[PDB]
Nucleic acid binder design. Structure first.
Lengths: 342, 188, 342, 117
DNA sequence: GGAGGCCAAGATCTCAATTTCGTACAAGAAAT
DNA sequence: GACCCTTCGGGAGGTGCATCCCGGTCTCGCTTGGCCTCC
RNA sequence: UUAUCGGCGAGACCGGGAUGCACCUCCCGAAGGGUCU
């Protein structure tokens, strides 16, 4: 068992963005911040870890074998336990505290669960956050605005029947009237939210009620729009993302990694390199990354770690250089004693 | 050039290479403790305790007298917006108010010549002659302008170990107004 | 169902501009900057995605065809769903447990919606940002000034009756005196725009109220102009655009692309190549591009990608290389089982 | 409804200049640069578009013809709309309902506004 | 067949609730 | 083979629209006998 | 320092949709000239 540290950089091919419920607020979309509003945003280790765990789950599904017409020989409980560590059945063998070698048999038979952990079983893999290199390297990408297709180019209107043209007329008049009414209501709402700043606690209750009621008024005003519930033409709030070519330092660790588990992890990185996507806004191709990792193992009691090799994920291929990385991959590919079932 | 490559290391060997280099200053300390406050010397030139002959602070006990008046937290914020270098008007009004309340010659050490110019503009010269250090001027000319007629001397930058002392030598400014701590800009 | 990466370059035959609302400010039309204020501008992947989505929508409209008068069988709501992914009828539920397996059907029947997703359906296509290769490949274009026709050319005066010449006289005197009045109130408004800068928050908001009432005074002075509500002579603010011949690296991805969806994408690229216009400023011919893409596939688990072919879009034609791209295009063209009434 | 691409060359019979307000500075009259100080200057598409729009306006007033005194039937507003593209009476609004599907008919009736917008 | 070794029950409950560091000057050279 | 003399003034916009929603966990800080294996 | 001793821990992709676009001529005026095998 070796402790492998993948220390390396994620270069950004297309902006790297993520919406975490914690970070974002009503002020707009913000990246998860390194402890403060005026801090360097980091790409969370949670998103990277989930992407790699799903890549490893697909690696396992491929490695066992797609039988039938592509259906994998795994139930839904197994897929959830392998990819998210949640047992829907509850039949997962909960290791009562104090159990010696907790899950050692499960770790030996399920290298994936050993790597990415479960409830009551520590995951050997720790996927750290990707911290950017240098000031800036983040920006408000996306954005823009929905425009009515038929108000932009008139040729598409030759493809619309008369009744559909009158439908568009009614839809736009409805959008305008709803916009004016909702905007007046929102002006009242933001004046009320300005009255928050005069924060007398006794008033705050009456203001939260008097603003959530005005937001229900907004919802009801939208609900009576026969043609379109939502205004079709509207500016898109931009999302904060790491710019293209941004260098994000990444640290990943596998504690006490067997050659089988480390080979599974390297195969997960290999399959991730096919679709090296991190985060969301994949409609704008956000998340495409090329990443290079230096694998260094550290024998405990030795003052220095030794370098096993380098994993380079690039659009031109995966360069896994190093005798020990290939040894790990071959050992994982050649071990037939993994039970991923219940 | 810069200390981006830790050029400091170089000069550190230089002090070693001589028989002995004596680095002294009136401000060669951050704290009153030698080994906690001189560690910026222990960390910038690269000279370390082993090769450091001594690390000490010598302060007289009875040297002069001093009354301290400091602005509190409530005092108006110096910069309404520091980035584009705008000084909040409330702070300007307070500063001119306290400057005019002085009944004798004083030495105002602002931080920037831009601060010198704004404070001079905001002052109504109600007090005895106000002497201003123009951006990129020479201090000693205002020094000898000030010896003939002591008054209020607003001189940013300046200092570098200088003093508007009189002819035979005497403290000719009972007050010294440090408007703002000369906080260095952020250097990307 | 394989991943296709279109990695390639967009060369701008004419300047390439866009005004995205967040990027643009009181200064004027400015490209999004790829980070901070001084960062290298990029052409939004949102604009490219919208242009290609509308090209694909027109491709599908032609493929289904038109009736004798030339209208399309698609309803207005179907058009909006196809080219914007908005249900005007509001039947798109976000996370309804009954759509969990609505995916494969809605994909194989509607390759366009599968490519460009909807509210609840992830788009298979990710259209990334066009990032310039070199530096100083952008500039301020369109700088001009509208000038009175009859002052630049004196012949047009002989085309106007006496009363119309007197109307032009009144309009010119109106522009002159109204503009000097507007200039006086403008220099007062920017005098106190400079004055708020060093202002406490109370007086800050007081000067912002003074600015908004001098703005309403601007509007009122404009109203009083009976001849014209707007001035006729005025310097047009230039817009920021990528230079002619600028090389912009572009990355587009089709995740898990089936043959028909990829063929629809290639047909969309061809139809966009009929009018290779990106962005806006259609006047000044801005937006015309010559783009070449290397389509590469990456089977998950493989260490290298395989270059299926190249899609070169030039003003002299569209060249498609590799048997695979042709096979995908033919598969899309020969798949008659698309029901786009989703 | 066919898209025409006029790809071609302008050979300069006599020196071709333009005073773009951005491009000029106190340093001197400089042609609008294709990005940066040292790029290759271009002749703006705005100037060519204005020249061609005024040419088309003169074409249209010539085809409509002139009365005995030689005054075109159009008014000042119509001239400004046809060549200058600015509304004197305020009858121009963006994204307003009612003009949906009236643009095609107006374009057919007014080819000048159709072309130059 | 008495020593481990795992597993279920024992009736009750205290208590508490969040909005953005630092903004410059010099003096003085045998040069990189 | 030495200077000349460096121009004004215009005029700087108008609108539209700012989404829908998920779904917020297990624990456990002690002792005892009952039952089940089993050295 | 009214004693001595005690890692709190293990799992989770927040993602899914959008062309921001639509109009403008920046032009109007001028001799750079005269002297010397």
């Amino acid at each position: 068992m070796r402790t492998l540290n993948f220390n390396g950089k994620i270069s950004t091919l297309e902006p790297l963005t993520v919406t975490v419920k914690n970070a974002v607020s009503t002020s707009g979309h913000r990246l998860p911040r390194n402890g403060g509003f005026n801090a360097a945003p980091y790409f969370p280790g949670t998103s990277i870890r989930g992407t790699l765990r799903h890549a490893a789950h697909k690696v396992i599904v491929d490695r066992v074998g797609l039988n039938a017409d592509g259906k994998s020989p795994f139930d839904l409980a197994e897929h959830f336990m392998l990819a998210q560590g949640v047992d829907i059945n509850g039949e997962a063998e909960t290791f009562a505290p104090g159990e010696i070698n907790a899950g050692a048999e499960l770790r030996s038979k399920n290298p994936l669960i050993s790597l990415f952990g479960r409830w009551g079983l520590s995951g050997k893999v720790g996927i750290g956050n990707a911290i950017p290199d240098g000031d800036n390297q983040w920006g408000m990408f996306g954005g823009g605005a929905r425009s009515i297709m038929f108000q932009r180019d008139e040729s598409l209107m030759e493809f619309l029947e008369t009744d559909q043209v009158d439908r568009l007329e009614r839809l736009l008049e409805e959008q305008a009237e709803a916009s004016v009414d909702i905007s007046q209501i929102k002006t009242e709402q933001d004046a009320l939210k300005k009255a928050m700043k005069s924060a007398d606690k006794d008033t705050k209750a009456e203001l939260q009620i008097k603003v959530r009621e005005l937001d229900e008024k907004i919802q009801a005003r939208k609900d009576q729009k026969q043609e379109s519930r939502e205004s079709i033409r509207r500016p898109i709030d931009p999302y904060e993302a790491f710019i293209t070519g941004a260098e994000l330092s990444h640290r990943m660790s596998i504690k006490n990694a067997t050659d089988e588990e480390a080979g599974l992890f390297i195969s997960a990185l290999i399959r991730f390199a096919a679709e090296p996507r991190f985060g969301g806004h994949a409609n704008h191709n956000c998340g495409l990354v090329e990443a290079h990792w230096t694998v260094t193992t550290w024998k405990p009691g030795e003052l220095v770690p030794v370098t096993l090799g380098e994993i380079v994920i690039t659009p031109n291929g995966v360069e896994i250089t190093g005798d020990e990385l290939f040894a790990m991959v071959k050992a994982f590919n050649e071990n037939q004693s993994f039970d991923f079932t219940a | 050039i810069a200390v981006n490559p830790f050029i400091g290391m170089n000069v550190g060997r230089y002090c070693t290479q001589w028989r002995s280099a004596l680095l002294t200053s009136a401000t060669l300390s951050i704290t009153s403790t030698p080994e906690t406050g001189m560690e910026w010397l222990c960390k910038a030139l690269g000279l370390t305790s082993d090769t450091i002959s001594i690390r000490k602070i010598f302060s007289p006990d009875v040297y002069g007298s001093m009354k301290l008046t400091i602005a509190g937290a409530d005092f108006p914020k110096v910069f309404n917006d520091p980035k584009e270098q705008i000084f909040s008007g409330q702070w300007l009004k307070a500063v001119v108010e306290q400057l005019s309340c002085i009944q004798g010659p004083a030495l105002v050490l602002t931080a920037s010549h831009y601060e010198t110019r704004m404070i001079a503009n905001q002052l109504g010269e109600v007090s005895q002659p106000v002497y201003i250090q123009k951006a990129g001027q020479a201090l000693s000319e205002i020094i000898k302008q000030y010896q003939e007629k002591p008054g209020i001397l607003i001189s940013a930058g300046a200092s570098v170990g200088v003093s508007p002392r009189g002819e035979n030598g005497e403290q000719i400014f009972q007050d010294l107004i440090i408007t703002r701590i000369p906080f260095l800009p952020p250097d990307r």
